[PDB]
Amino acid sequence: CGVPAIQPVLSGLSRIVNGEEAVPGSWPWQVSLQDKTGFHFCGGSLINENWVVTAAHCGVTTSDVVVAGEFDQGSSSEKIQKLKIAKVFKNSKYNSLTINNDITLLKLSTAASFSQTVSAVCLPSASDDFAAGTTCVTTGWGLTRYTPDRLQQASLPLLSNTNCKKYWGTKIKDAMICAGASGVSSCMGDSGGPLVCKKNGAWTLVGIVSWGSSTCSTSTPGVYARVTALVNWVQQTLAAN
Amino acid sequence: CGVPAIQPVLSGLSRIVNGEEAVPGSWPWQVSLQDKTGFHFCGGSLINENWVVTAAHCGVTTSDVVVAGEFDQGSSSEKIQKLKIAKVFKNSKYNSLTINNDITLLKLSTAASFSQTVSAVCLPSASDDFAAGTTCVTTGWGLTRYTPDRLQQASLPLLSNTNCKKYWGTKIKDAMICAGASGVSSCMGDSGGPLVCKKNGAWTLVGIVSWGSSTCSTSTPGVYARVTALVNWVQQTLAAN
């Protein structure tokens, strides 16, 4: 997990404004969640061939579809996999008002076929420490909510929850982690999309997009579900299902 | 339906700032949606003894609870009914990105016991015309997201969708209706709460709270699921279940 067959290329432009375009296929866990009609409404991350992790506030149902291996949403020519969802597992501690514990697992009806462009992100262990100031990466097609149709990426630093509260106040709970406010927007992250940090040569899922600045401010950090606080629930869910 | 045993009293103060406190029990279809722990996160409306209608973006589950007959959330002394949810029916056309078709039905495990303070709002027919400029009423505990603990009410006019787009642009779809921008906030409406209009002596559910001004501006209208566009789905769901 966490080792893309096509290595990402992150330049200085990933750190400013709205980030930059990713190398095609270099974020191979990145999936698109689409409705029956093919409308993209959220992101997610493959954690193995049968399971995708996304945000609970995406409200995914078994009539939505996971699309893996995508780079250009405007293309009908690239190799993609449209994967049916068998069952949706929303974390029972999710609260649609506070948006805390904002995580949902999707079990696919049939396994994805992993490849150079389709593979899994690593999960952290509950006890991993991702220190404030660590540079991490968010990817997605979130800029299409407001514009490039190809997958974007931005590099941005984790904040301490204390410093995040200077921006978002009592909205920030222990099961959340913030990143950004460093001169780049977080808006390229789709709801439910990944925030990944590289430790020991492997990209690890540290956050899941919950919400960000309503104006995509370069000085307001994004807010993410804190995966270390939720990975025990993830592993219990996989083991029981 | 739509005829409260305790008649509402709406004064001029319902039309300005943040509205006014309701007469206790005078909005008897108004329910509170709470999690297992008793935390209020959304509103809804009883449409009979077995069914509550709310917003799809509330993400209600069968472990949440419907609380009927409530006036003061800070009181443990008033007669309320805590009702378990048997099954949740989210409209399959709901889209968590656009927030269109934002309606969910809750079927209760055991019927509410209707009374002077607990009874049903009327549903419109699909073909009813609620003209722009009609004065309607939104009720709820939505101000507690930011403060009074008792049920509030505000009187505010429906907008045409064309005029609503002057505020919210392409966010406004045919299955939405807007109200407000007349000198009063819409923020007293909980997510999923009622927007009711009085025709022929009966209060009718015209809207369900979808979203409003992030700053509770008195000059920005609230956005509601348009019940006339969704009532056929409501009646099909009741008939099939």
Residue B108 lies in a domain: yes
Token couple for B143: 């101000």
3-state secondary structure of B227: helix
Q: Give B34-40 contacts, CB < 8 A, sequence gap 24+.
A: B34/B64, B34/B65, B34/B67, B35/A95, B35/B63, B35/B64, B35/B65, B36/B63, B36/B64, B36/B65, B38/B65, B39/A95, B39/A97, B40/B67, B40/B73, B40/B141, B40/B144, B40/B190
Catalytic residue among A32, A45, A119, A191: A191
Total domains in the fold of chain B: 2
**B81 and B141 fall within a common domain:** no
The distance of A39 to chain B (nearest Cα, Å) reads: 9
Reported structure resolution in angstroms: 2.0
Q: Which residue segment(s) compose the domain that B104 sits in?
A: 28-120+229-239
**B211 and B235 fall within a common domain:** no
User: How many residues are listed for chain B in this entry?
Assistant: 241
**B113 and B159 fall within a common domain:** no
Question: Which residue does chain B place closest to A38, by CA atoms?
Answer: B95
The rounded Cα B50 to chain-centroid distance in angstroms is 17
Interface contacts (A, B; CB < 8 Å): 46
Q: Is the Cβ–Cβ distance between A207 and A180 less than 8 Å?
A: no
Choose the mutation target among B93, B96, B168 for the interface with A, i.e. most A CBs under 10 Å: B96
Catalytic-residue membership of A191: yes
Residue A39 lies in a domain: yes
**Cα gap A1→B171, rounded to integer Å:** 39
Token couple for B186: 């819409």
Non-local (6+) Cβ contacts of A81 within 8 A are A67, A68, A69, A112, A113, A118
**B34 and B139 fall within a common domain:** no
Q: Do B92 and A61 touch (CB under 8 A)?
A: yes
* Residue A138 burial (10 A CB sphere; 0-12, 13-18, 19+): buried
Whose tokens are 């078994």? That residue is A62
**B136 and B211 fall within a common domain:** yes
Residue type, B45: S
Token couple for B173: 């779809």
The distance of B64 to chain A (nearest Cα, Å) reads: 10
In order, the DSSP letters of A158-173 are B--HHHHHHHHGGG--
Q: Say how many C-beta atoms besides its own lie within 10 A of residue B134's C-beta.
A: 16
Looking at the partner chain, which of A41, A94, A97 has a beta carbon nearest the beta carbon of B95?
A: A41
**A146 and A217 fall within a common domain:** yes
Catalytic residue among A102, A119, A155, A213: A102
Choose the mutation target among A62, A73, A96 for the interface with B, i.e. most B CBs under 10 Å: A96
> The sheet that has A221-226: what strands, in order across it?
A20-21, A152-157, A135-140, A194-199, A202-211, A221-226, A176-180
Choose the mutation target among B54, B97, B190 for the interface with A, i.e. most A CBs under 10 Å: B97
Catalytic-residue membership of B129: no
Residue B8 lies in a domain: no
Catalytic-residue membership of B75: no
Non-local (6+) Cβ contacts of A37 within 8 A are none
3-state secondary structure of B157: strand
In degrees rounded to 5, what are phi and psi of residue B156? -150, 150
**Cα gap B106→B195, rounded to integer Å:** 18
Non-local (6+) Cβ contacts of A228 within 8 A are A124, A125, A126, A127, A128, A130, A206
In order, the DSSP letters of A212-240 are --TT--TTSEEEEEEHHHHHHHHHHHHHH
The distance of B62 to chain A (nearest Cα, Å) reads: 10
Residue B191 lies in a domain: yes
Residue A2 lies in a domain: no
Catalytic residue among B14, B185, B186, B191: B191
Way it was determined: X-ray
**A107 and A144 fall within a common domain:** no
Angle, alpha carbons A176-A182-A183 (nearest 5°): 130
- N- to C-terminal Cα separation, chain B: 21
Residue A7 lies in a domain: no
> The sheet that has B202-211: what strands, in order across it?
B20-21, B152-157, B135-140, B194-199, B202-211, B221-226, B176-180
3-state secondary structure of B18: coil
Q: Facing residues of B195 across strands? A: B138, B207
**Cα gap A241→A107, rounded to integer Å:** 9
Q: Give the CATH number for residue A205.
A: 2.40.10.10
**Cα gap B124→A60, rounded to integer Å:** 29
Whose tokens are 């007959």? That residue is B69
**B135 and B22 fall within a common domain:** yes
- Give the residue from A109, A98, A107 showing the smallest Cα distance to A57: A98
Catalytic residue among A57, A64, A155, A186: A57
Residue A80 lies in a domain: yes
- Give the residue from A175, A184, A20, A148 showing the smallest Cα distance to A73: A148
**A157 and A207 fall within a common domain:** yes
**A203 and A147 fall within a common domain:** yes
Residue B81 lies in a domain: yes
In degrees rounded to 5, what are phi and psi of residue A95? -130, 115
**B20 and B130 fall within a common domain:** yes
**B61 and B106 fall within a common domain:** yes
Q: With left for phi above 0 and alpha for psi between -120 and 50, is residue A201 left, alpha or beta?
A: left
